[PDB]
Amino acid sequence: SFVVIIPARYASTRLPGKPLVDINGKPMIVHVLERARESGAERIIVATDHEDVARAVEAAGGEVCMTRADHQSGTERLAEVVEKCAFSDDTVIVNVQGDEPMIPATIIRQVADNLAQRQVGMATLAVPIHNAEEAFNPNAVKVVLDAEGYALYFSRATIPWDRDRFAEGLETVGDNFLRHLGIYGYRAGFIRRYVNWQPSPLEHIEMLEQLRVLWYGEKIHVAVAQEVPGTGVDTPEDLERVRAEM
Amino acid sequence: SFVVIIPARYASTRLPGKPLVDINGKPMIVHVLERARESGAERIIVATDHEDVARAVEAAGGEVCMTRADHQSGTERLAEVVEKCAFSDDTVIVNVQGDEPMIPATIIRQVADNLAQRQVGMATLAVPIHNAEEAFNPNAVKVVLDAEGYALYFSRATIPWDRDRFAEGLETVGDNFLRHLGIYGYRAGFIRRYVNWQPSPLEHIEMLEQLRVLWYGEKIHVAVAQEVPGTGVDTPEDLERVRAEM
Numbered sequence A, B: 001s002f003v004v005i006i007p008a009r010y011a012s013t014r015l016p017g018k019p020l021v022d023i024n025g026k027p028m029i030v031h032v033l034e035r036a037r038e039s040g041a042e043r044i045i046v047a048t049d050h051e052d053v054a055r056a057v058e059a060a061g062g063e064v065c066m067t068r069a070d071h072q073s074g075t076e077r078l079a080e081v082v083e084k085c086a087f088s089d090d091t092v093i094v095n096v097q098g099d100e101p102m103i104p105a106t107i108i109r110q111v112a113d114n115l116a117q118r119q120v121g122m123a124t125l126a127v128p129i130h131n132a133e134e135a136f137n138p139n140a141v142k143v144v145l146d147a148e149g150y151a152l153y154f155s156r157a158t159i160p161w162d163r164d165r166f167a168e169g170l171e172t173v174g175d176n177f178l179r180h181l182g183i184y185g186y187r188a189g190f191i192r193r194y195v196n197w198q199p200s201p202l203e204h205i206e207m208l209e210q211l212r213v214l215w216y217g218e219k220i221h222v223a224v225a226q227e228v229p230g231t232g233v234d235t236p237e238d239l240e241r242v243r244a245e246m
């Protein structure tokens, strides 16, 4: 009932060659592949631009689609896979980012289901932040929601800003921050629409691909899950933490 | 063609008693009144909760409406004024905040005009920030817009966050920052709608009354003016600056 595509370019800047970094005997990309398998997805494809990533995935028995080196985000890379596989417009695609080796299968299913149950073009998920270090870390993307759960904005800045608390000091946070997880649900037809839009100025400043959608006035629904152990892997520090936790 | 209402409660927390602070021989509230007069507004009302504010305005020949002490924002206070004056729903109201003694008359007129020409419930304005101090100052409210100029979010946080520039240092900013001005255009019918909503959690965290509107899924249009003098008076530092510049 849904397809998972995992975008995994080699030349990440904050952690070069990250799809292939070892985590307890397997490259990160293979761990993400396993989360996708566990979700029950009908088809799972790794999209990459690098032969060494392709070989690792093929050796783990996963399907691979080679894609252009000049894509500027995972979602842009997905559109090439979508065109090559010729998915119907109504086919549900879940982008599980190659930097999320600990994302639970249940969360993958939840995003697909949430998307299919709403007339929204794109669905995603966030989890509460419980410590101030993460609230003030620009590598942890924060998201602020409206009353219906649609995203107002995603940012690397600390939003929503707590005026009175932070005027005092920056060492504590209340119970109102949300960390955005690297996963998106969207139908193939929406992915097509996404790459047909001209890039927003906003997405390039924050380096957050989802801002293109908000810029063109479309909604993103964000479900909130209370507990999800682990973290995405964007820095050397993230990698050490994940190595220890898995 | 429009009514100006200036909300001015006495007990500000960041600058106590600010409607009465001396700015070069006249209290701040009287300067705001003078800006409102210059706009050509058909009627101008200062809404206050304090007799000494009332007296300063009356001594300057201005109209005063006493209002409850328990209002939690200028917009809430304006609703009491709208009922007491029994304005019709379609009456165009411009909230010129009591902390904007330097706001140009042209900007006041522009917000009223923008509101009237659009199907939108609420209109406001922002000005490009070209210095790093204001961009990183939580007393300067930043806003990020969509392609059509509707607000995605308003925040005291530094948005949009420049990932690559700021990873290096906070010394400089690009050209992508907008400072929100303390002026709102809305019809009386919208003000009535605003206070029919239960308060949002979001507005209390940021201490930004306009966030109630985004929380409940309604739009705010933001015009951008390229050049606007002065600043909002919220801190002692702002007060020194406006005293030097007015």
Ligand SMILES: Nc1ccn([C@@H]2O[C@H](COP(=O)(O)OP(=O)(O)OP(=O)(O)O)[C@@H](O)[C@H]2O)c(=O)n1
Pocket: A007, A008, A009, A010, A011, A012, A013, A014, A015, A071, A072, A073, A074, A075, A077, A097, A098, A099, A182, A233, A234
């Ligand atoms: N041009 C890009 C950038 C990102 N991705 C993929 O999208 C996912 C999420 O992006 P991110 O974690 O930020 O990866 P990078 O962009 O590669 O890393 P960095 O931002 O540090 O440069 C990653 O699996 C990455 O491989 C992609 O396919 N093409």
Ligand SMILES: Nc1ccn([C@@H]2O[C@H](COP(=O)(O)OP(=O)(O)OP(=O)(O)O)[C@@H](O)[C@H]2O)c(=O)n1
Pocket: B007, B008, B009, B010, B011, B012, B013, B014, B015, B071, B072, B073, B074, B075, B077, B097, B098, B099, B182, B233, B234
């Ligand atoms: N409960 C409130 C708070 C604000 N205002 C008015 O709304 C305008 C903008 O608010 P702000 O500049 O923040 O004033 P204060 O809320 O009074 O100051 P502070 O946030 O420092 O406590 C001001 O003219 C203020 O008098 C109001 O009428 N009632």
Ligand SMILES: [Mg+2]
Pocket: A207
């Ligand atoms: Mg990236």
Ligand SMILES: [Mg+2]
Pocket: B207
């Ligand atoms: Mg205030």
